[PDB]
Design a protein around this ligand. Structure first.
Ligand SMILES: Cc1cc2nc3c(=O)[nH]c(=O)nc-3n(C[C@H](O)[C@H](O)[C@H](O)COP(=O)(O)OP(=O)(O)OC[C@H]3O[C@@H](n4cnc5c(N)ncnc54)[C@H](O)[C@@H]3O)c2cc1C
Ligand SMILES: [Cl-]
Length: 479
């Protein structure tokens, strides 16, 4: 028996964060390496696992790692990064920073991956993930014509790649701000809760990537919010027994129908849209009008403030359950048989209401701060950059594009391009993000890489100039 093989194989199949971490530590012990140790550790792990279970994975990862943009792991070798958030986007960003050869530490306030809701994937992201070994880590990955994945499964497979690539991850620690350089010769550090170990507390970095999700409010960044017409989203997960009969039930990708009237007549349910993905669960997302929610007992009081309206006190869980099951049942014409709610992490029926009204996007995707001669590049990636409207399925795509554009920006930074040029180039790319679609991007997704010219047709990297981004560079002194 071979402990390294045993731990690698457990690591591959692990379905819980704690199991991924513990099997990875066992693997590191067996192979004479450390976790969080950069590409040198990746090289030592893979050299020692040239065998049936692992061979195909190293082939894929080495293929990506060999793309010219990474300069064989030397592009950012003097760059130190802190990534905030182990969501799909912060993990995807870290993988990229790791391939560039940067030192990558990532902090995440939670300690498990608990979300089961299902995310739509554009063709480029499906290729992207397959090319990182998704099939090895997740046997069900975008099989057939399926183009979606549950959040926690996406997190698990990206966590595994990040770990193999030597990203140093800390859990149960909340990024709360920055400790500015105290004097010349000092670097930037993070404010973290609760008190972290000497190494983390004193960890200095020149790049901060914030991928902390929709509710994180980035400091120094201007955020644009528009409150539109009230819209209330509801998501639900039902147990999928994966029977032959259940598989026949067609998905619903997304009133342009007589359907919504016939739904309203039969049930009293007034919807604007409904979506059904056949994933690890039978997952539904729908947008409901407030008046039918009040009428059907889902909402207790007609409160004018949306966050009170959709607050825990105003939502009746039993009525929300009847509402979601009745809509899902009607939408799929009963062909899923008797729907049973899947359980959330806490053991409750997995159904929830969300504010679909306000859409937020950062005014800029990056800033630079300098104090005492120490420069810090700050980048936003994922939901904290632009909040996705879930039914339209742009979340993973635009999060990953933001992750790529941030990493390219870090390559430019590492080249010594200087704060204003780095920001102007990044912002020229950012102007495109909310208009992106598969249709208007480069068609050859197999050739997508960090270089934005691989991804964005007829690229104007000067759409924004150095002079226009001056306010994004907070140079506090001349040191
Ligand atoms: C509860 C929930 C349900 C969702 N349901 C759907 C859905 O049904 N369909 C859909 O399309 N999209 C859904 N989304 C959005 C989808 O999950 C995201 O678009 C996708 O995961 C990419 O987001 P992200 O990685 O930028 O941020 P997130 O997935 O939000 O990840 C952010 C991470 O940062 C961590 N974090 C936050 N603050 C800090 C801090 N200060 N310090 C350290 N770590 C921090 C969080 O714990 C989290 O792990 C949902 C999101 C949530 C939060
Ligand atoms: Cl978990």
């Amino acid at each position: 028996t071979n402990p390294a093989h045993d731990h690698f194989e457990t690591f591959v199949q692990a379905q819980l964060c704690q199991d991924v971490l513990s099997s990875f530590q066992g693997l590191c012990r067996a192979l004479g390496v450390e976790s969080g140790g950069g590409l040198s550790q990746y090289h030592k792990i893979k050299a020692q696992l040239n065998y049936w279970s692992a061979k195909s994975l190293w082939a894929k990862l080495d293929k990506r790692a060999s793309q010219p943009v990474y300069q064989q792991g030397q592009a950012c070798t003097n760059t130190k990064c802190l990534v905030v958030g182990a969501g799909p986007c912060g993990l995807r960003a870290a993988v990229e920073l790791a391939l560039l050869g940067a030192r990558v530490v990532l902090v995440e306030k939670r300690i498990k991956f608990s979300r089961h809701n299902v995310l739509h994937l554009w063709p480029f992201t499906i290729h992207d993930l397959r090319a990182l070994g998704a099939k090895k880590f997740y046997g069900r990955f975008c099989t057939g014509t399926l183009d979606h994945i549950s959040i926690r499964q996406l997190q698990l497979l990206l966590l595994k790649v990040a770990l193999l690539l030597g990203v140093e991850i800390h859990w149960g620690v909340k990024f709360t701000g920055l400790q500015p350089p105290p004097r010349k010769g000092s670097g930037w550090r993070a404010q973290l809760q609760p008190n972290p170990p000497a190494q983390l507390a004193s960890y200095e970095f020149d790049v901060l990537i914030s991928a902390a999700g929709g509710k994180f409010v980035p400091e120094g960044f201007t955020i644009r919010e528009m409150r539109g017409k009230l819209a209330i989203g509801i998501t639900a997960n039902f147990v999928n027994g994966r029977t032959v009969e259940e598989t026949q039930v067609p998905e619903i990708s997304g009133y342009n129908q007589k359907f919504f009237q016939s739904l309203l007549k039969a049930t009293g349910i007034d919807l604007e849209n409904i979506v059904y993905y056949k994933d690890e669960t039978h997952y539904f997302v729908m947008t409901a009008k407030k008046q039918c929610l009040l009428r059907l007992g889902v909402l207790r009081q007609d409160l004018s403030e949306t966050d009170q309206l959709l607050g825990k006190a105003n939502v009746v869980p039993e009525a929300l359950q009847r509402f979601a099951r009745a809509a899902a049942d009607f939408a799929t014409h009963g062909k899923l048989g008797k729907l049973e709610f899947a359980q959330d992490a806490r053991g409750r029926p997995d159904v929830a209401a969300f504010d679909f009204t306000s859409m937020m996007r950062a005014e800029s995707s990056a800033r630079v701060q300098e104090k005492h001669g120490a420069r810090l590049l700050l980048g936003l990636v994922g939901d904290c950059l632009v909040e996705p409207f879930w039914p339209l399925g742009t979340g993973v795509a635009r999060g990953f594009l933001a992750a790529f554009d941030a990493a390219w920006m870090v390559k430019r930074w590492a080249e010594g391009a200087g704060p204003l040029e780095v920001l102007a180039e990044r912002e020229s790319l950012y102007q495109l993000l909310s208009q992106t679609s598969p249709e208007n991007m480069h068609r050859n997704v197999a050739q997508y890489g960090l270089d934005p010219a691989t991804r964005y047709p007829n690229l104007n990297l000067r759409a924004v100039t150095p002079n226009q981004v001056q306010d994004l560079y907070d140079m506090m002194d001349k040191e």
